[PDB]
Amino acid sequence: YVDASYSSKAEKNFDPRPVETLNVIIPEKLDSFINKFAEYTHEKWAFDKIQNNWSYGENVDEELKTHPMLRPYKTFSEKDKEIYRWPIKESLKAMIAWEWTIEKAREGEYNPQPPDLSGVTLSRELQAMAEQLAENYHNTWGRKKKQELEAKGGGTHPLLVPYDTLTAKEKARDREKAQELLKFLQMNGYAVTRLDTSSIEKRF
Amino acid sequence: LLLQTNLINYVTSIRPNIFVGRAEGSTQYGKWYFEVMVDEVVPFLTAQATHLRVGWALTEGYSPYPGGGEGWGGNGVGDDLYSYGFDGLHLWTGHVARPVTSPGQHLLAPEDVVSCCLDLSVPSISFRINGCPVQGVFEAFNLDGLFFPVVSFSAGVKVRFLLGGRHGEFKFLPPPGYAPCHEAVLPRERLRLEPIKEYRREGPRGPHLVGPSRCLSHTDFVPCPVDTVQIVLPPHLERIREKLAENIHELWALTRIEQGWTYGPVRDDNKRLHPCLVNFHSLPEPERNYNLQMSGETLKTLLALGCHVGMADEKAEDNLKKTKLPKTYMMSNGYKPAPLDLSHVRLTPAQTTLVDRLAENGHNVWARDRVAQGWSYSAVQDIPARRNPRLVPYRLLDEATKRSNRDSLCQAVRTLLGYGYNIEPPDQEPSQVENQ
Amino acid sequence: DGTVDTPPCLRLAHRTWGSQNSLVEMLFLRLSLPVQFHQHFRCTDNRDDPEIILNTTTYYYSVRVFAGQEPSCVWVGWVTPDYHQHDMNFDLSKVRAVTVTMGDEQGNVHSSLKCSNCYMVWGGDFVSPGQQGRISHTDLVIGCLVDLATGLMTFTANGKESNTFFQVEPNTKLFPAVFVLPTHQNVIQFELGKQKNIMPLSAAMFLSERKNPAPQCPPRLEVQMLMPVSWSRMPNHFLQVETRRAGERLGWAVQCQDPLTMMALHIPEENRC
Amino acid sequence: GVQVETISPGDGRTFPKRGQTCVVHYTGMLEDGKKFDSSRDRNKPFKFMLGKQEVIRGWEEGVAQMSVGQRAKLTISPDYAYGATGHPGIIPPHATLVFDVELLKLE
């Protein structure tokens, strides 16, 4: 037997410790990507609406079962644009806090014409970091979820488990989110760097 | 409403073991021809008229079982959509008889010769009876299988297959471009007449039960060499790649010296003259570069197959013995070619399996290259017609030639081991083809 | 059963869909009774006209692909009684086809008939390339029209006439058939209804109902599935065939002399014995 | 309404005339492909004399066009056979009859 995920945190109820990055200063030398991709993820949500077969609307309503405030950039208020960037801000903080320096090898630069997909493959070393980042998505998600739950002291959320323990079907939420960020870094050429074990050596 | 009963005759089909088909990149020829001569037919041996049809059938689907079936039983050629028959008066397909016009129409009678033509390019099937054309053709049919000659008959018939060559001289000249069916026999099989998907046969002590029969597919004649697009060889492998071509040429020249080849300006097999039969360096470089493309793939296929190879030893390359041809066994030039001496070299059993895979790939690379040039398989070699007996996938090749390619690849591997380069046999990945 | 607004139907449902050990594979279905074209073809509100409906030779039936079942995995049409193609990767390219062409002494094609055992349309040809939402709110209702007096077959997507059509020879037997790969609990539904001035299938399958425009689903009409393997009886005796190489110039000889006869039981509607 | 399509050629010289007994072996099927009669099953050739209206009128012209030893396929229109009345229990009304007839000899 060879485990597909041949890696471990080697750490240690269950208390998911997040990653401390607010204390350390966030480098802003790559702000051309920080702000652009922060609104690009929400720009991809506009493409998700046309796939939902229900378009975007201006008025707030619960009947369209979609985002009610999604507006074309001509009449799109920046109040929501200036608050949707926060998850991306900490996402870039998270991947840079784990001693992973990012270098811009290249030097350049209502519909998101460039399509960001997740069905393509990627190298093992770089994808391992994305899965580690996806783990940080879950523990931070688990941390805030358990803070509300810990007020009772009895019972626990069914997904309050370590990231390696949960199966793939419940992993695709954080898996695709981390991969999608890595895919955006892939076609542009962002180099982030901190093993080579054959299948025979991975057998039990 | 009520079930109907009637007495019917049993009908059996007999085919040669000749299978032809069309596929993208296939090594098979496209146009085929054969004849069937009728010697004796009893028009009414029983209350029902005697069955006799001639035509082509498809391997994947034509399985006439004795007894019942479509319509009123007695299913033969043209009683389904996998066969296309001709009984002298009608063209049979899909169990429907369509009258056809020929000079002097009559049901198949003694001394009648039926000529069947199969042109897979259109595709089209045409017939001729006693030399006159039959004004009716099957066309635009399926090609997902192999086509074989077939005759369906009841009791009271006596026919002879005319397949050309030594297996029945043709009474009429085949139309231009068509090849006799005897040229389509595979190297590993002998021509014979057999039933079709029989589940029973006679034996010494009694009837023998027979299971399903393994059948080839039209894709089995398409060579599938491993991908070599990733052209990235290590620099130590790149330099030794050209030197590998030098050694294999001498080994190829040495084997020709055993066959009697000598030095000569002209390169002919029958004349046994070879310019390379002097020395690897005296061999012309452009002639040496002829197999340099092949020599480059030989090392590349090692990387392609997954083998781990590197310059483990450099001192081994520097110092190594050189086997030379005996002075008694000299060519016209009289010099002694010096291929690398690798008697001390030994191969692990896993490495021997690698040589077999290398030999299989090398044949397939040569095969698909010839197909792109227009070459096709034929039992009889015809250089002007670009017909070659070895224009077949390696698995279908006969053992005599299969061993010959295996020995040549072994020397090439021995040459690499003679240089001391490490060769790691890949961890073999099993697979199940599921042919049926 | 047929209600006031719906015709009688034969609905297929997947018992174990979604659950563990569920079997999902290509399913080949057909109705138990065929429609037979006439021996000779003719030369060259929303209420049926009584004179038209009693003289028409066009018959109709439709298949409802329920929402959730992908139309791309549904084939609707007809099969001849000699269809035995149990392909797990079926598509319209696997359908057996052959053209028989007749001509005079010098070319001059005067007859080109087309033969097949499966006349079907693909459900994937009746879906617009919308951005997504391919599982539609509306079920796809593919209708099939056959004119027994002309041998012409036409199809309708959602009431819109399709471009595909087929032509068949007289005395042809066609079974209403649907080939589907299940993707939902509700898969398909044979709708044995009628259109304006068009008779239902029950009018063509039964002699006693030739002039009855009311749709019917008699008990004999049932859904049949294609079974890959069946038991068959081995004959007690087999033809003695002698094969030998008569010589270099004579070739290979086939010979069979002793007669053999069996008593065949023929099933008329299935055209097999 | 008789069409005579040859299956195997005869002598091509001797033809049956009026008042001459014809000995034939036949197998009759409906034009859709359903057999209803055959002298082969009874293993006894069928004998009849032309001009005496012993058989259906379709056989009168069809056999007269054949030669001794010839095997031919006769397609008879309903008018030249039993027609509207038909043969009760054997041949449906307005049925076209197809016969495979071999003229064995004349006597």
Added chain:
Amino acid sequence: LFAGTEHRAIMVDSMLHTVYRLSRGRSLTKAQRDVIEDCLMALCRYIRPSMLQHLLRRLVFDVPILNEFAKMPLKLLTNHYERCWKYYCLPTGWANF
């Protein structure tokens, strides 16, 4: 009676977690604790191996601690893998499981 409860796997899994969580309960007498442990052992003996996946996931986090509460899970895991070894080892898996 829990042998064929595949159709109600969500409720069965919740039952297994609750009884397991009861076993790791303070203020429980020794007599009460073994009754809870016996119930958990009995349930896992008849429940299909596929439905025990979530319970095993919880045990992966707890057993390696090897505290005083780990005695019962060790016995539970021993019986589970001894009984269902074909389910994990054989490529074809356990028969009808």
